[PDB]
Amino acid sequence: TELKGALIGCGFFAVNQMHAWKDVKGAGIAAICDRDPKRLKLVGDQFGIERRYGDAAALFADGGFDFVDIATTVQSHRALVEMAAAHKVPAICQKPFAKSLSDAKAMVRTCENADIPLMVHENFRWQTPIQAVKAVLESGAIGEPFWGRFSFRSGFDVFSGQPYLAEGERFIIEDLGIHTLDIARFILGDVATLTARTKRVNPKIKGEDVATILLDHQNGATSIVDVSYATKLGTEPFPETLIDIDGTQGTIRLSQGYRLEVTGPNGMTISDASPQLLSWASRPWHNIQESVLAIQQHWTDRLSSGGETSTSGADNLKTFALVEAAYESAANGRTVDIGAML
Amino acid sequence: TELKGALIGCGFFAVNQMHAWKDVKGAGIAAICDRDPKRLKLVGDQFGIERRYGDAAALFADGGFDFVDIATTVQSHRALVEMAAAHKVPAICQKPFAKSLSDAKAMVRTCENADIPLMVHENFRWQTPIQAVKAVLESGAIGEPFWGRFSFRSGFDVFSGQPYLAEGERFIIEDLGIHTLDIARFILGDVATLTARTKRVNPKIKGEDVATILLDHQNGATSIVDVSYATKLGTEPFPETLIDIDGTQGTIRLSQGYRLEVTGPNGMTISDASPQLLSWASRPWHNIQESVLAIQQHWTDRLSSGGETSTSGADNLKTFALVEAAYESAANGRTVDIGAML
């Protein structure tokens, strides 16, 4: 009784998704699809997949899978989610959700009308350390949260591993900040208003590589989301998100090296919140790679129980709005209203 | 020959100024003034000052001093500076400079018109660790700065040492934020626009005790100034201002315990930017206390040479505007133009 999945987009990151599908219990991959025959062969051979397609339409016409995992680039997300809805196939879609908030909304409305589950593969909130911060905060250990910082500052050459990122007129917020904004929603709740600034430092890219964002949360909390790929430190933190939360009765400080510090009324604890290094994982991306298992296992459990997933399409609109709002704000110079976009 | 100072306002912080005046070379205190005779007697007896005045008008009528050190609370600042200008006595004025930017400008104008120096006693930038950040950045070690964070988050009970701070409609930006803003100007230069948010967490004060401020610096740098007196940490950092600066070729990290990490094209340097401990100083105020001597020696040196001071009245208008702009931004939710205010 394993769920049979089809994966569409056998790119670099899909390799991680395929390994994790292997580990996931109650689901496995019965078919793959990619436009590039060399990627289709590499992944099909690596993972022992007999069913191989050069195009998604043909895959969907043949059928015989219970869900679809869409790990293509953003251009094809809307069409592939629409094809899944039309064939009543529950769907997972990689980030970014779509090219616009407008496209993402329509994709959500189509999967609601087809009565199928739609999950965005937004895995940063599923990292072990981020989950731990969530659990501490939910316990009431530090009372009500009023302030936060969510920070990802790196000097890591990500432009080798994928050199199209150096090409877009937009870069760090769409590629990385999207995750940091999602973490900030996950911890501190939905955002009412957003103000952002962006800067290009690296002479060799088109897009912005520094973004500083100020979030007014609906629950009254204020937070800072700062991201950078132009930050040159003496020990490289890639790809760790560092988090500070202040509450009425204490603080949470998740610092470099997965160190989790919690001060409350009953003193102060320090714990290790680092990931399990999986058999197929690789330092220092083992953080991100564990989260792939966590989120796919979450999808699979929720597909059996019939519950809404945590980064459902509907939920992810509220993250996606913050990406579009930040680009709008940085160009305008203006604070953007989030509720008026949704 | 030693310059003779008169100090006006023999309150809790003036005690530090009087110790420091002793240690200053080329200057000493020859008269004191306080409206409260208990304080006049306590400070007069502690420092062996024979000339003692119940009111500043009579002090200025007798004369016999080359400069005046105004350590009163804000209400009386403008009058006392005006009295100093009319009597052609060079003046030091405590922060906050005045009640409004408007009063502050009039104070600058009267001192200019009377051809007397006027310095705001703004001592945080004269702290050894802050000076060391400045020196590192000016040496070129990390390239052009593009981003900064200036942070003072504490749970220290400042309300005991001075109970009026609990009373006012405003608190943390006027009292402390003013310093953090000055440091941000000192390191990253003058500010073009400002956006600010405030909150009251502590249920036993009337004023705001949390503020988060986003600065667009004239030179294109972005910074966060974030201050809190409702942050409960495992180690109390009071009263350290923690600083992060990202540049095009490196980074500066001034972290708790006065540790200074600098990374550049060569590698990483770690230094100890701890303050000295003067003979009369007490932990944990010793850093602030050292900076009192530094700024008062700076005054004395500049008065003797003919030069202008670093935190002059003219200069401090650009710090003070940020305070006033922050309260305005926080009320309207609007970004505020600093250039327009000056």
Ligand SMILES: NC(=O)c1ccc[n+]([C@@H]2O[C@H](COP(=O)([O-])OP(=O)(O)OC[C@H]3O[C@@H](n4cnc5c(N)ncnc54)[C@H](O)[C@@H]3O)[C@@H](O)[C@H]2O)c1
């Ligand atoms: N933390 C994360 O979850 C994470 C990490 C990296 C990348 N991503 C995201 O995952 C997605 C894929 O990233 P990647 O780095 O693997 O890109 P990639 O270019 O390596 O992979 C995309 C693959 O999809 C194929 N493809 C494109 N359009 C297609 C279509 N219409 N039908 C079938 N196949 C198609 C391409 O041939 C390619 O092999 C992107 O949206 C990216 O933003 C997410």
Ligand SMILES: NC(=O)c1ccc[n+]([C@@H]2O[C@H](COP(=O)([O-])OP(=O)(O)OC[C@H]3O[C@@H](n4cnc5c(N)ncnc54)[C@H](O)[C@@H]3O)[C@@H](O)[C@H]2O)c1
């Ligand atoms: N880091 C710093 O530089 C620092 C630290 C603490 C306080 N301060 C500033 O120093 C100032 C004083 O703070 P404080 O805590 O010492 O206040 P305080 O209330 O302890 O002292 C003020 C004194 O001035 C007297 N006074 C008031 N008006 C007067 C007048 N017209 N003439 C003569 N005396 C008068 C009062 O009787 C009192 O003794 C404030 O403006 C505060 O912002 C600066």
Ligand SMILES: [Mg+2]
């Ligand atoms: Mg499996």
Ligand SMILES: [Mg+2]
């Ligand atoms: Mg002396």
